[PDB]
């Protein structure tokens, strides 16, 4: 009947942030750390192997070194928590924790990762000064795949051309718009993706003297 309990079986965590994952195990009176054993794993990858108050660091995975730690402090309350920071995307997947202290049980938990596209990069250039043909360009990086919607100041949608591609596994999304326009005409690109439905809208203001390429 000795059982391990996880307060949350889900984690939706944004790229590069930090998260603590929690496991709970019965403790009465004071915790004997000689007799405590913890293991943290993610798919085929060990993460921590904590035997006898001493965390075995020869065996932790390469991809985790100096990133994810077992908080040694909470344990005394029966809470053995994995602390990872700078959530790296390839951490998305199913973890599971295993506690042998007098008895043993394990519970698995999963975590997925977002990466909003909220830093948008603009470029505005003329390609044909006579026809006033300009080229509006938004790019941005995130996870999972995104799509790009172009809109005129008067809120009409317009046809763009976009390219999705990879950075590590990150998505790089470029979209350009070729439309005749003049100075001080404002246009918008909004980046909309799925998963945790999210959107980020940039404003592009045509300059009097745009560059050309």
């Amino acid at each position, epitope marked *: 009947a000795f059982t391990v309990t996880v307060p949350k079986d889900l984690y939706v965590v944004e790229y590069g942030s930090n998260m603590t994952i929690e496991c709970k195990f019965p403790v009465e009176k004071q915790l004997d750390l000689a007799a405590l*054993i913890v*293991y943290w794993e993610m*798919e*085929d*990858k*060990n993460i921590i192997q904590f*035997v*006898h108050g001493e965390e075995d660091l*020869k065996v932790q995975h390469s991809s985790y070194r100096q990133r994810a730690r077992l908080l040694k402090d909470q344990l005394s309350l029966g809470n053995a928590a994995l602390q990872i920071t700078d959530v790296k995307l390839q951490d998305a997947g199913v973890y599971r924790c295993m506690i*042998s202290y007098g008895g043993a049980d394990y519970k698995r938990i999963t975590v997925k990762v977002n990466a909003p596209y909220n830093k948008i990069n603009q470029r505005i250039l003329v390609v044909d000064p006579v026809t006033s043909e300009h080229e509006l360009t938004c790019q941005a990086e995130g996870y999972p795949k995104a799509e790009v919607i172009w809109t005129s100041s008067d809120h009409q949608v317009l046809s763009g051309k976009t390219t999705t591609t990879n950075s590590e596994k990150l998505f790089n999304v470029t979209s350009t718009l070729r439309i005749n326009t003049t100075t001080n005409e404002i246009f918008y690109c909004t980046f909309r993706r799925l998963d945790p439905e999210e959107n980020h809208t940039a404003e592009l203001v045509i300059p009097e003297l745009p560059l050309a390429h």
Partner: antibody
Amino acid sequence: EVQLLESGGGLVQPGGSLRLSCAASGFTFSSYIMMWVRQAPGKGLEWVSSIYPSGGITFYADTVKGRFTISRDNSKNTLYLQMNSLRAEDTAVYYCARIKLGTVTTVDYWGQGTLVTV
Amino acid sequence: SALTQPASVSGSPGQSITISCTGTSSDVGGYNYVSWYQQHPGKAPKLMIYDVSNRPSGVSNRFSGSKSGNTASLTISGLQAEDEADYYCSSYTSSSTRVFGTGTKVTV
């Protein structure tokens, strides 16, 4: 610089008992996940049992659940498999496989086996 | 539960050859952990590559590995006659288990 020596297998009746051992020489065996893997003659190779270094966490393949039990003495740096009421389908070669550090499931070094015949 | 490896392939010296390993959305096609093992008959299986392509120090560059979608492939180059042996692939699985392949027997 590493050796894994299976010993104890032989001819036993169906329903009998056999204790398979694995002598382990090599890296610090108190830190490794260890495993048993069986090869039926000519056939594919299947995983039977896992054991974590310490804490006594073990795992068994569904065919084998309940009549096989695995153990390990981290001082004597060896590994055992107790086989009870051997069925007829349980007759195959038995390998003792060390799990590469970091990786939960990936063996790297193996021993040469020992025969079990039902 | 098994990984399907075509049992019969073969080829002559100084040549390239590719064994195939296929499996489910839940094991070889879902994870980047697939390991390949080389053994001559009645001998001591040798890890050759791991984690889809990675090979440990001490395996000739003549061995690389590849995973395309659901299907994974072990390639031998500069092929020689010692390398004729039963070879197996393997993968982690959603059950936190390693499935192994039926094995292929390459012959020089």
